Amino acid sequence: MLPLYLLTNAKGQQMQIELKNGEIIQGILTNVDNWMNLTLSNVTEYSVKLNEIYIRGTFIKFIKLQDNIIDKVK
Amino acid sequence: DFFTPATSELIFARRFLINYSLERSRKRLQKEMERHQKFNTRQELLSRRTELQRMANLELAGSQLVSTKPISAVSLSTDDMVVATGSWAGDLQVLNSQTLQPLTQKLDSHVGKIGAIDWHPDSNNQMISCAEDGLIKNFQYSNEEGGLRLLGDLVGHERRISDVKYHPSGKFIGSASHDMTWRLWDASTHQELLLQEGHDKGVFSLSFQCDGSLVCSGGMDSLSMLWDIRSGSKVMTLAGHSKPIYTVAWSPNGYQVATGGGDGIINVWDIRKRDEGQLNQILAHRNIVTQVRFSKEDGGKKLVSCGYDNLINVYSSDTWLKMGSLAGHTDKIISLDISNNSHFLVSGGWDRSIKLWN
Amino acid sequence: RTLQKQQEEEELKRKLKQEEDEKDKRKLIESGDPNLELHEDKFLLDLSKFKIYYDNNHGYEWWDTAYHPSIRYVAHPLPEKAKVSIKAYLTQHERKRLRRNRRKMAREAREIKIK
Amino acid sequence: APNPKAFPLADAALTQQILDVVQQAANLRQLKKGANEATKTLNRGISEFIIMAADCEPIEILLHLPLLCEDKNVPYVFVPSRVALGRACGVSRPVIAASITTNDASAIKTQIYAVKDKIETLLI
Amino acid sequence: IKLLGRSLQLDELRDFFQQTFSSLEDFKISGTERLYYKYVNFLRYQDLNEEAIKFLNERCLKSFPICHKFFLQLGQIYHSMGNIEMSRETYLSGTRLVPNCPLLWVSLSKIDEIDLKNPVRARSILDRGLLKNPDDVLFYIAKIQMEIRL
Amino acid sequence: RRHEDAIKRRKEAVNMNVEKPTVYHCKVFQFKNLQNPKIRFKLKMNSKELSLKGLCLRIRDDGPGIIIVVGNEKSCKFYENLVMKRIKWNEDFELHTGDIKMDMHNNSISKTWEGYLQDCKFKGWFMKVCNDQDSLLRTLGQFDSEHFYSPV
């Protein structure tokens, strides 16, 4: 299906986000918009523990989803 | 057969019933006329909430053990002088209302488990009693003479009887038996006139409308059939119960009927409106409903119900909602009766002890 | 634009307080004068309904308005009236005997058959 | 009808449930058959409830018990057929009265309280 | 307190009491429930002083009041001097404050049947309390003991 | 093989031929607060497993509400067991979104009613929220039972 629709069905799931600066951001998804701007909970980054972080959609390289994303989503 | 019997003794009495229920119907509805004419929301609703608050604020006053078996029948005499109580090992005793100490000596009358017991509406201290035996007995009672002196001894039935009532005229005594028939009696010659088969099982309860017009008969078929004594035929067949109807009572005004069933749901039937809003159903007690009563001299407007749940609960004639739950019974509550002045409640149950509420 | 919006917001805010006050007034009226949550409205009698009702009854009551019925006779009508599977248990003697007979039939069947 | 006298008398469905509890407690050894052992359970007071038979003759021999049940405040019902009752008790010879007794460790205790509750519903 | 109690020494028991309260300046009601109870209990062992015992359980029962031991001891004040109305009323307020306590209902029904007599009020009391708390068996025990006394 | 054949016999045996037994066992419950999602999940899933014709209503979310259940006496009995015994209504639970801890000591459960009624008009078990007691009593009113909810 559609990626945005999949991130709409997926709420509150652990995933490992890759950004353009090259820093790992491992977090739990909260809300998704049409611009795929991500807000995560229980956030920890690699080159820092954070309760919540805002993520711009355009700065994202790729997203490592959990394996059950199809089961929990669909 | 339909309409087969002639019933000669009945017509002479039945015309007395059309005159009686006619004049008391007009008089009663005229009192209702003045009432609905003169009421208003303010002292109507404030007094209503006051009385309901009183019933909700009632609490167990006292208790007096009586019989070796449970107390099946509890009925307050006219002007709440004494209470008549029958048991399953047949004995019936009257106890002074307030002090609750037994006035009469132990009396063994009925052989089987005693059914309903009622007091004569004219305050003559004549109490009718039914039991497992086909005998229903009149008992003349006095303040001080001694014991209880029976007058009439009546066999109308083969199997166990259940509820006997007085017609408001006091000249007729209704008897509901586990036979297909429920019968109506004379308070003079003690003979049968009405005999009715309305049900495939026994008729477990009778209730006379306070104007004497209509008899609501709760059956074990889970049907309560409304029989005009004068019309000789049913007015309406109304069954909301899935289980046998273990009690029925008329509101002082014929505007409301209350049928306690074996479903624990009290079916309150307004028969003034025949095609709309007949039933107002009420969730009464955890287990089934034993006896239902009305506030009497208050002109109804307050109901009180007891069942095999250990609570005795109170209702109003309009909201029909639970104002409060009445504790005090360690065990099943098989019988209940209200003071005429509505102040105190007198009940009995498998606790084998009469109880009061003040 | 912002100012106008702000003004509008203020107005809206103002409007809510009056409604709250009205609700409080209603509750006060209710204490001494009915409550719908408790169904206290049901205590009200209808002069129109009861009046046109009794006039429709033409005096007396809907029971005896027919006073047409027959006094001469007494009805005894309509003696109006579910299959349940009957489970028949049985003794340990008839369980042991039953199993013994069945296994005897199968045993003799296989024995004579193979014979 | 199985006699005018005997009361209360359950229906086919509740009779089926009660007889099911009869066989079950009979498998748990929590049951006592017969009028004499029923009487013994009533006097001891360990009886949860009394089952009796409607079709039995004469009826009086089972009519001595209801007085004792009402004395001890224990519930009782009448199954229609003594043949079906004893057949549920696990005896070919028809039994008239059976008694479900009390066990605090019994696994069917909840079943006994439910059926007993419906019995108390019937008693009146 | 039990020792000097066995030796029966009024000055050392009383002075030691004042020492105990002076140590109770630290307050926080650690174990003090039985402290006040034994204090009023020996001040009961002496025949006199019963009035300042009333005031004593008025200030202590005023502070603690959930105690339900002070309601029993004070019902023993008014039952000790023979006040049936005072006793009864104090057991009523007591049962109103602590419904979970059987001893108050039991003593209440006792003073009902023995003093004001009648069975009626007593049976009513044990019934209403029983259905107030169904859990405790001591209430059924109360009804059974009352009945076997009847 | 007997196991698989039994699973097949049960799968084809789900609906059976079974008619309406009537004899509907009905217990209405009322609750102060359902906010704990675990509770609503237990009500949904358990009601679906036991096939209980009934419903669960509430006033303005956190506000009080009613539970109504109809069906076989055994199934409804088990339901009452899970509502009363298994479910602990006095409890702390946090809403997972951040998280917001809702600690309810006051929230409790009580059985308002138990008993049989003829002709259940519930076609299924329908949970709903109502913004006011009026629309709640109309929600009960579409089944022509107003009286299951008694405000106290």
Side-chain angles (χ1 to χ4, degrees), chain B residues 59 61-64 328-330, chain E residues 120 123-124 128 131 143 147:
Chain B
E59 188 178 3
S63 63
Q64 183 64 58
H329 287 286
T330 302
Chain E
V120 175
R123 284 194 292 272
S124 63
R128 58 179 291 179
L131 293 180
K143 292 193 299 183
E147 184 67 13

Side-chain angles (χ1 to χ4, degrees), chain F residues 85-102:
Chain F
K85 301 292 183 291
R86 296 176 62 184
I87 289 171
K88 271 69 180 180
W89 291 88
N90 291 336
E91 188 179 3
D92 54 349
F93 58 90
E94 60 184 342
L95 295 174
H96 300 290
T97 59
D99 56 350
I100 294 171
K101 294 181 181 298
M102 296 295 181

Side-chain angles (χ1 to χ4, degrees), chain A residues 30 41 52, chain F residues 96-98:
Chain A
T30 59
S41 63
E52 184 180 3
Chain F
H96 300 290
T97 59

Side-chain angles (χ1 to χ4, degrees), chain B residues 12 21 40 48 70 74 88 100 114 190 233 248 251 279 331:
Chain B
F12 177 81
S21 64
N40 68 37
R48 185 59 57 87
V74 172
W88 291 0
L100 189 60
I114 293 173
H190 302 291
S233 178
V248 61
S251 62
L279 60 84
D331 195 69

Side-chain angles (χ1 to χ4, degrees), chain B residues 6 14 28 48-49 195 318, chain C residues 40 43 61 71-72 76:
Chain B
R14 176 179 287 179
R28 181 179 63 82
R48 185 59 57 87
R49 181 183 295 177
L195 63 87
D318 293 342
Chain C
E40 295 179 352
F43 296 104
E61 291 173 348
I71 294 170
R72 296 286 294 173
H76 299 82

